[PDB]
Amino acid sequence: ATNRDQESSGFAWWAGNARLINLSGKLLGAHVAHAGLIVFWAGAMTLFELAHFIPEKPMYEQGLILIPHIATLGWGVGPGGEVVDTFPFFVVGVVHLISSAVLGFGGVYHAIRGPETLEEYSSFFGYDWKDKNKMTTILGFHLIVLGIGALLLVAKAMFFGGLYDTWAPGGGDVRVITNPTLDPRVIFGYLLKSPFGGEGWIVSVNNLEDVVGGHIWIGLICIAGGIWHILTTPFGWARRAFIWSGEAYLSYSLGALSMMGFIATCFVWFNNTVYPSEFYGPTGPEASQAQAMTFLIRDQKLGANVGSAQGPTGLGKYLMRSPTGEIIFGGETMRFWDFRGPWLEPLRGPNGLDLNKIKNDIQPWQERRAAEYMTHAPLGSLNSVGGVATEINSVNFVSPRSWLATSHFVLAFFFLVGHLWHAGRARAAAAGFEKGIDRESEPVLSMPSLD
Amino acid sequence: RGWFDILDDWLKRDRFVFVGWSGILLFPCAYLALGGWLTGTTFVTSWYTHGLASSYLEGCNFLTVAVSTPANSMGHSLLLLWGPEAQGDFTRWCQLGGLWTFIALHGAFGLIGFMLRQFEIARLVGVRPYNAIAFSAPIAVFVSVFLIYPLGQSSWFFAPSFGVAAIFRFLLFFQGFHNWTLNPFHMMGVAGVLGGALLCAIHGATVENTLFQDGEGASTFRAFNPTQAEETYSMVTANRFWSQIFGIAFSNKRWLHFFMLFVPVTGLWMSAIGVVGLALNLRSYDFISQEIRAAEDPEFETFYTKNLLLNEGIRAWMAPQDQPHENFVFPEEVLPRGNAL
Amino acid sequence: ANLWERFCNWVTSTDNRLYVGWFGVIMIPTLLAATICFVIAFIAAPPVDIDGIREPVSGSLLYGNNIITGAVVPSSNAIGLHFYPIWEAASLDEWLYNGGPYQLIIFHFLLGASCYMGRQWELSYRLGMRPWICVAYSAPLASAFAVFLIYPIGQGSFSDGMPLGISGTFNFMIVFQAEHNILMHPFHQLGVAGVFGGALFCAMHGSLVTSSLIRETTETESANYGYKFGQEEETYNIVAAHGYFGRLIFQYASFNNSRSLHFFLAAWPVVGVWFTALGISTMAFNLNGFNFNHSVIDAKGNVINTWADIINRANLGMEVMHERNAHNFPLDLA
């Protein structure tokens, strides 16, 4: 009965993990074991994807979410995103899965056999939630680990073979990055960009030099904040502003993770740089633009003067002006004129789409990419019938972009709910009314009537 | 003790499942409505009535199986098994739709039985019968939608079929033919259902977040003894919170739980009135003033006119297959459609 | 003390008739701007080109609407997700044509209602209450975020946000059914169980507590006067309500713990409405309802229609008529 029942710990079975709040050794096991599960999943899932992978189909026709992450880092892939060597996928798969077993072993050791509490076995690993100096010290160590990790991506991009660059000429290619962007006017400009249409905040990053440079800054920022925190203790103002409990720190991180899940949702939906459409399928905007392109191409091939064709509304049937005057594709897709992609930018001139380039310079690879993307638009049914809601069964397809966006919205939403739950409860518990109102001193009863 | 009084004793015995006089109506009619639904969604087709598969046997799943309405050509026939249409042939009864009337009518009588049960148990236990009175709203819905509405139409065909997606179809039929969203009686019903759900959630969260500390555990559910005298939460602090947050608050616990009864019960009753109207096609379909203007002024457009264009789509695109007995044949060229789509 | 501490103490005063609080400092001006703009546009705003095709929809009372047909009309498809403050228009006349009021209202409203949520937490802290009322409110708040913000994000235009109007709302639901088969989506089925079940349980609890009111009055006075505000004791016999309800079904389908009963009342609708809000929020990314079109075929391969195929005939009518002048190419991909 070392905690472990409701009479001694105060929490019922359905809130049993709250029994671990002041048992630092068992809590360590829970985390390591759970890290075990994450690394396990990364391993098992990748091997599933490899076992099901057919290199002649697009990745996005085959339900793959993790192999596209590996390809974007420049392994297993060549010009145009063609898979040239599946062996690196196998390696990522096996190495995580193996590692999951030592993590697994370490977690189940700490949760069962190890000391329930660390604070007497060693003064370094044991911790009290209320120790403000020890908490920022742990924070600081993890900050450094994170900074290291950011610099691993930099290492891969500059020294260990580069990254997949969808904007690389000749249809994309792996490419080593040698001029990362360090100018903080760019790096931090992204952060001051509006999140609205045509600007897109950090989701608008559209080249790998900016991406690699951002990860140099972030790695150095994290390493330096680690040192900062390892060495400092919180100032008076910060001490008065926050709740210092184990549950409050949880709520702060549920907050952070929520925000991050929402950002990942928009990254995977709009960004075709660090989520190459070669791998993930086209963006919603992209598929919609590709359809306008397709039928422009067809009708122009038949003799339509696409620039002077007035549609039913009076607006151009193929081409019209954005509200700042840029030449853009007409139709409903007028909402998507912010889209940028390597298959489309060759037709772009200073005033938008260039009609001479449209009349003369459209290559078959563009017509092919536009037809491919328009028929792999990220629309489909929960049971993976591809196309619009009224389509008949036949095509078995749902875009990785849909799966990844929907899944991380849900998850971000519930981690916001978690934040509020645990934040409010941490406040209540710190003021000492989390179990209800004291009948003998009900605060409202000492207050003047509102009227 | 007469035989009646002896049977009374045995029916009102305190057992795990109370029976009562009401039970003699309730348990057979409910078992059979239930059973007939399971039997029909598992094994029975709608091929001869509707041109549709409708059972697990045919390859339908849980969302698309239905016990479907009988063919339009049966009118409002009771479709008794020993009646003139099936002539006692069970197999033909199923094929002609008899399970739909079987379910409809045994459920009607089972709901009666359930309400009488609410009355019977309330009387013996000694409480006021407000729950039975509340169940009047489900009965108004069931009778209005499943009985009255088809009796006003050409036949039982146009009642709701008993299935998940059959009921969805019914919703959209009601939008496209009746413009049911525009009906103020449905709108009051929406308000009572949504406000009922609102009352449900806000009363539950309020009580849970004004609890008194009556034990020392973090699981606050154990600090309640059903025989205690005391309120387990604070009406006074609840009232102050809501007065300051929303401007008003309940102060009277009885009025508050009477209001929780009233709101959803009154919503369902209003919606039932509207459906009786639609039994006669007495719809709130149009606004004449909008139509007089729109006809004369081709630049006048509102969300009202946009929604009618959608209704026009639903009717023409869905009627031939949804009412196969009409033999509707719509050449491609007559089908209303906008540009491109 | 000094000025800033006086202000702080007033802001957080539990003696103000309406609580202000720090969340209230943002909530009040954003809700006032949203309300004032909404009331004026609903009465007097001129027609708005919602779909960007120079086809303005009239939404205000003075331009020919009634209460049922009127709306504040979503901003132009031509704008998409671009930010369209008043100061970005060359004139108020341009702003009104392109639907600027809609953006102003929804943004101030989403912000105010978010702070309304935070304000519920804030007062519960100042009163010594448990804090999770605001969690319950998150279900409606998330619903609002979905139809006014998330769904426009995924689809690329505030022109596809929900209109601020009675008929506008219907428009939005119909188009949604054709474009996503929301009726066949499990999360909206969860939402319907959420709200039906909320209503049912609402009526149940009201009827059960009302049925066990303790005789404290005569037949000529409202039963309601048998309860006095702040009274020590309970005014109903919960043992009796369980005794009734436990027999109506069976003894353990019934709740004898008040706290467990009221937690169930909170959780059922809240969870269900979380799911339907997540349903709009993920159909925003075109993960749509189940598709069973032509899912049954016979030995030869003829299509054998089911009810899902009849739904699809309806959807198709909605699809091909909506925004009848807005599509030039054959797929409606957003």
Binding site: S449 | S243, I248 | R17, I67, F229
Partner: peptide, 30 residues
């Protein structure tokens, strides 16, 4: 006339809100 009527009724409701909040029956602890 119809516009005036809808606005009048809406305006009365807003005035009802004001009295129902600020001029309510005050709750007391009997």
């Amino acid at each position: 006339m119809e516009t005036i009527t809808y606005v009048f009724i809406f305006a009365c409701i807003i005035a009802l809100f004001f009295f129902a909040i600020f001029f309510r029956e005050p709750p007391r602890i009997t």
